[PDB]
């Protein structure tokens, strides 16, 4: 029977049969079932002997610190892992029962409680975020470092599915072709919830966060260090949701970490949502002179050819910036940012294109100077601004087309704004006695319209009569001078004349005449520039 | 060997070895394989003893009524379950071979057949949908109640994957943190296909419909009762497809069910598609005085702070309304609705913002008064209307910006419509001898333009000549009065004058003159309002 | 014990215990583990006896040609399969280290190397793509046909999950309700990477490509032949990514293959991305007289009622066309195409609607005559054009509304272009001394504006003064004739007069006067069309 049993049954060892995880790992052939809670010590390392194992978790890994998995064979899968710390730290909860953010240090300190969730451990970033909190926090609430972390070290082709936990972290160190799939809402600890770190060895490639969600955590939910997806864009974050990150929802590191670059290139950031991060929704910048990366002589600061594939992202409720990035030659599309306390978008980009961007009700707390900032020479095609709630857009070197929304024109600063390809147009006016097409030359004034074409009701509704007026500003008084057609249904044109003797220089073109007033004779005269260019003054109207 | 076998093999019991499902459940340790069809009786209940089981289905559960699963441990998964009724009911199929909807009661009654799919069992909702059908339906086709339902009762953390069936239903009763994942197109029965009902106990939380699709069913495909995802928005429908729901594709219940509220808050509704529902695509309203919920004194009817996260939804072919909802303070984005028989959007919302909405060819059967209705004070930023086919938009209290499409202006009713931030503009005219910029004051007339700026060809194509004309309406005749520049390439301005003696009140501004006709002397006179405001009549032109 | 063991353990056979795959298949009951590499011969066929098996792959299937799986029971799943050829062919790599496409045949021939990846085997399509390459390629690099293919033949309800490979292909022949799920980036061979072919038997239905990605391959990444998803749209490609297809990313075949139709209907193509295909991103056409399909008498060429559900697609970097299709009565939405060498969109459609389309920087290599082409009578609602880089749009029979972007108006050709529903308007000018609203009648001239309304600064910035001017083109000189209001802050209107004796026909309307010059008397005269329609010439101004 043994011969037969050995050939007809599925192989699997279970943790309940061993004293240590390494013993179970050593006995494993195909499957490994975690069927009893396991308390690990920080730094406990397991060697899986290069075996391609299917690890099914039905219990917890309990401990502060890192549980290190090494030598897992390509194709290994770990499903249902649940990490939980032994320590219950002091956490702050910077929001109210009405879901309003608390910005006052004293109010935030008042939220202090010991829990493994529904808040996060304060870190130095909070000292900046809630000024004065550093001196108000009790000593036992400062410098905490609690995270129960599953560290996958130097493995290739390992996937972690439906992971969860309390004060949990997942670290892929020196890994390639690894994925964090369908994270089952783990509640974060002190470190990043999902981290792909490749500071040593080759640049990380094939590393993804696919689907799922995370909650809380003191720093960023998903973060990458020294990863390059190649032209194939093999890596990134797709279909992910981050809620209440103590740092940012999704972050590509910037600058030098250690003696090398922590920057990232050629990754995908698509179909993801970030809600209520304490800092930013998406922080995709690379610069904060670049050991291990391109020299400043090759690419100036904020001008690296990051080449990320960015599309279909939604951000709501950030206490910081909704969407931030830098780089040169980027194509970004379909970004929607709503209800943010700081800027909706902070873009240190150059020679980049932004298509179909919607920034709705941002910088609600005036943390920044604008709702959307673009530093370099960029192109914006389709920009929706203003929801239901300081410049709105400050992109001094950018050319923009297609803005929609109830924006205040005096709060727009761009290099060029134009609608070159509209068809025949109709201006529909509702709730007013007039319809208008206004012109504003920002060089003359950002606050006053310089001229206009209006249509005004004669009499009342259903009168079947209106008058058209063409105006010009004079003496900083909009519509100061104007020509009318059909005022009071008179069916004639009312023409403005120079109130005094017209100077020779008032007339512009040949074969034109300019009426002027001669008070001493109660006459209308006409300064005429003949077809040949010569001036002559004629009598136009008299008693 | 037994000692060794017990430690090296995967544990799993199979249904073929037991007479009842409970016996198999009692013997189960890790896995449970459903390897033979099992006929269950309505109400048959299985107690899984709190065990964390992995149930793999490779056969069917056959029976009318509910098969009840209880006491499954957190982390349990059921994959490949297939529910099928024992009864083959009478179903109607309200659409043609060309996929046209049938709206006539007699034509619908003519479709009657006995089948477990390709149609649905008529219910009272059909009496409203196809008027007169109640009296035309044969008695054996009325009041049927066939559904083979898998009911998961009062469990936490249980996931159902790749479920399917015929006349199938999936009910999560009093569950939390449960998910219906990748539904493998089950064909529905009389009740909802996927239901998260939490009328008793705590409000449902962590309940999701992730991916997959469903077909048919008499009522809604996915529905929620008394669920609240919290600020974390932990719950909802993401990446789902519903086809031909006899009710609505996705529905959050409204009103009182029993003695409590069936309403829902803080859920996500994203990246989903609803096609051909008999009623609505997405019905996300909460109100139809609120036991178990906010009193009317706190929040008036249709003004609850639902706070759902709604984004990236597509609806096509609804016989009812494409997208419907109510609530106050909502942010809704990226909704696309096409080819619907009733309104594309029916919005009983207040103080809400709608960004990038596309309503294309809706209310094709005139079931409603408009294509899009908004009751309260809302903001719409980006609205695409008209495809290739009664008001189009009736949002009396809303402010709108950015409408695109071949809309008839007389069919637009809004509080305010404006394009405040456009750049320099060009009106490009194709197929006509003129280009135009028209003005329409809806208060004066919704059907006639009040004034215009035109450019008209002089001669023909390639003439290099055109004339510009500024017009005004008089006597309900658009363009009745006008000033021209370069008519017939004459290079002069043609000016309209009052056809009779101008009354003193015809002139508006000081330092302006208004030409008028004096027929008795064949002279042109000029009513002049001097710079000082005094009137004087002068002779302008004479023989 | 045997009795007990037989009832408590999971059944699974492993390949290591058998000499052939068929032997393992014959012994299988529930699970089948591929735990050792298996070299198969082309055409090796395995009969699974109708068993519902769960095949877990932890090793490779090695061989050139097809490994054929037949008689798998409904519900069978194959996970982690890895196909690899025995031959290492000669591949070309038509792109540089800077990711620039190589278009020169000699440069492409220079890239030749033997590898199972990072390039593809040349085929006849390359002879067209890189002209002259056919004569430059060495004989050993021509006509190669290496693909290690897993062929699932005539099965129903079989799913392949997390498949991968090198020079790999996956062929579903005569299958229904089958899915290719989460493809783990297999590197393609000579044939299509994922193919659903239903040339024999019933039209394919229920076949999907869900999630995942593929890289390289000589032809199309995902392709369908004779599939019809029905009104339920049961089938298609959702959430998929294709990188560097030697052919197109996603393709529905056109024309006759063998003696029957290879066309497809009622499929879904949503939430997918195609990057860097050698040919097209999405090729969804059906026509290239239709055996096995609709006769030309019923539906003319390019006018089949395909009825696909198309939404939310992104294409970047195609060497060919970004998005192509044909058909009649189609609704297409939310398409984004960026940085393509050939047309962004090539649409042989009629009576179809396109909503929210963005074509950004396409036809960069002038391969086509335009960036977007539409042949038939279609409607486009929302069209974004131009990024940061020959007509732009040529849609002679289409009506368009809502174009945004820095488009050159002379490069637009449409049947009708209009913005019927805009509200009150403001034209904001940045960087210039004037703001303008221009009119262009394309029938008169596609390159010159026919008239304009300008506002120009008087003096300098902060002067609080500007002049408004209304112009008209004459003698092909834009703005040749004009009326001004407030030039040089004179507060009067400058009026142009006919430079010579005005002909009777110059005046258009009754009750209007047209000033004209009489050089011989240094007088301004006025051609007056009296209220009764009679002409009279009067003296207007004199010395």
From Swiss-Prot, chains A, B, C:
Signal peptide: none annotated. GO terms for molecular function: endo-1,3-alpha-L-rhamnosidase activity. It is an enzyme of class 3 (hydrolase). Disulfide bonds: none annotated. Keywords: Degradation of host cell envelope components during virus entry, Degradation of host lipopolysaccharides during virus entry, Glycosidase, Host-virus interaction, Hydrolase, Late protein, Viral attachment to host adhesion receptor, Viral attachment to host cell, Viral tail fiber protein, Viral tail protein, Virion, Virus entry into host cell. Transmembrane segments: none annotated. The active site is at 247, 280, 283. Its main location: virion. One of its GO terms (biological process) is symbiont entry into host. The keyword Hydrolase applies. Its EC number is 3.2.1.-. It is found in: Virion. One of its GO terms (cellular component) is virus tail, fiber. Homotrimer. Interacts with the host O-antigen lipopolysaccharides; this interaction induces cleavage of host O-antigen. Interacts with tail hub protein gp10; this interaction anchors 6 fibers onto the tail hub hexamer. Belongs to the P22likevirus tail fiber protein family. The interdigitation of the polypeptide chains at the C-termini is important to protrimer formation in the folding pathway and to thermostability of the mature protein. Structural component of the short non-contractile tail. The tail comprises six spikes that mediate primary attachment to the host cell lipopolysaccharides (LPS) and display endorhamnosidase enzymatic activity, hydrolyzing the alpha-1,3-O-glycosidic linkage between rhamnose and galactose of the O-antigen polysaccharide. Digestion of the LPS brings the capsid near the cell outer membrane. This is Tail spike protein. The gene is 9. The chain holds residues 114 to 667 of 667 of the full protein.
């Amino acid at each position: 029977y043994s011969i037969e049993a050995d050939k007809k049954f599925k192989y699997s060892v279970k943790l309940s049969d061993y004293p240590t995880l390494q013993d179970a790992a050593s006995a494993a052939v195909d499957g490994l079932l975690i069927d009893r809670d396991y308390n690990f010590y920080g730094g406990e390392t397991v060697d899986f002997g290069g075996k391609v194992l299917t690890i099914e978790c039905k219990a917890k890994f309990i401990g502060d610190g890192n549980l290190i998995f090494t030598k897992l064979g390509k194709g290994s899968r770990i499903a249902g892992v649940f990490m939980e710390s032994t320590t219950t730290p002091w956490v702050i909860k910077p929001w109210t029962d009405d879901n309003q953010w608390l910005t006052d240090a004293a109010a935030v300190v008042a939220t202090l409680k010991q829990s493994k969730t529904d808040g996060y451990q304060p870190t130095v970033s909070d000292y900046v975020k809630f000024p004065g909190i550093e001196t108000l926090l009790p000593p036992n609430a400062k410098g905490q470092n609690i995270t129960s972390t599953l560290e996958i070290r130097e493995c290739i082709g390992v996937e972690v599915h439906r992971a969860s936990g309390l004060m949990a972290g997942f670290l892929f160190r020196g890994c390639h072709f690894c994925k964090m799939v369908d994270a089952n809402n783990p509640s974060g600890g002190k470190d990043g919830i999902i981290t792909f770190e490749n500071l040593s060895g080759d640049w990380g490639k094939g590393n993804y966060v696919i689907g799922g969600r995370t909650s809380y955590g003191s720093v960023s939910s998903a973060q990458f260090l020294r990863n390059n997806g190649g032209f194939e864009r093999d890596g990134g974050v797709i279909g992910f949701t981050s809620y209440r990150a103590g740092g940012s929802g999704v972050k590509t590191w910037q600058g030098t970490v250690g003696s090398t670059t922590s920057r990232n290139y050629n990754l995908q950031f698509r179909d993801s949502v970030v809600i209520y991060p304490v800092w930013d929704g998406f922080d995709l910048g690379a610069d904060t002179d670049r050991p291990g990366d391109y020299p400043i002589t090759q690419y100036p600061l904020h001008q690296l050819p990051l080449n990320h594939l960015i599309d279909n992202l939604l951000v709501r409720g950030a206490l910081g910036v909704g969407f931030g990035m830098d780089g040169k030659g980027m194509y970004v599309s379909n970004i929607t940012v709503e209800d943010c306390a700081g800027s909706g978008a902070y873009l240190l980009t150059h020679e980049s294109v932004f298509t179909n961007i919607a920034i709705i009700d941002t910088n609600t707390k005036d943390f920044q100077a604008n709702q959307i900032y673009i530093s370099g020479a960029c192109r914006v095609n389709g920009l929706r601004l203003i929801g239901i709630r300081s410049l709105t857009i400050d992109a001094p070197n950018s050319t923009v087309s297609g803005i929609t929304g109830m924006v205040d024109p005096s709060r727009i600063n761009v290099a060029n704004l134009a609608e070159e390809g509209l068809g025949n147009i109709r201006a529909n006016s509702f709730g007013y006695d007039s319809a208008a097409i206004k012109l504003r030359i920002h060089k003359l004034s950002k606050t006053l319209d310089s001229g206009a074409l209006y249509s005004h009701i004669n009499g009342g509704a259903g009168s079947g009569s209106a008058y058209t007026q063409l105006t010009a500003i004079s003496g900083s008084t909009p519509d100061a001078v104007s020509l009318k057609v059909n005022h009071k249904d008179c069916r004639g044109a009312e023409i403005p004349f120079v109130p005094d003797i017209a100077s020779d220089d008032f007339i512009k073109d040949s074969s034109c005449f300019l009426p002027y007033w001669e008070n001493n004779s109660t006459s209308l005269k006409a300064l005429v520039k003949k077809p040949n260019g010569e001036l002559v003054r004629l009598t136009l109207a008299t008693l």
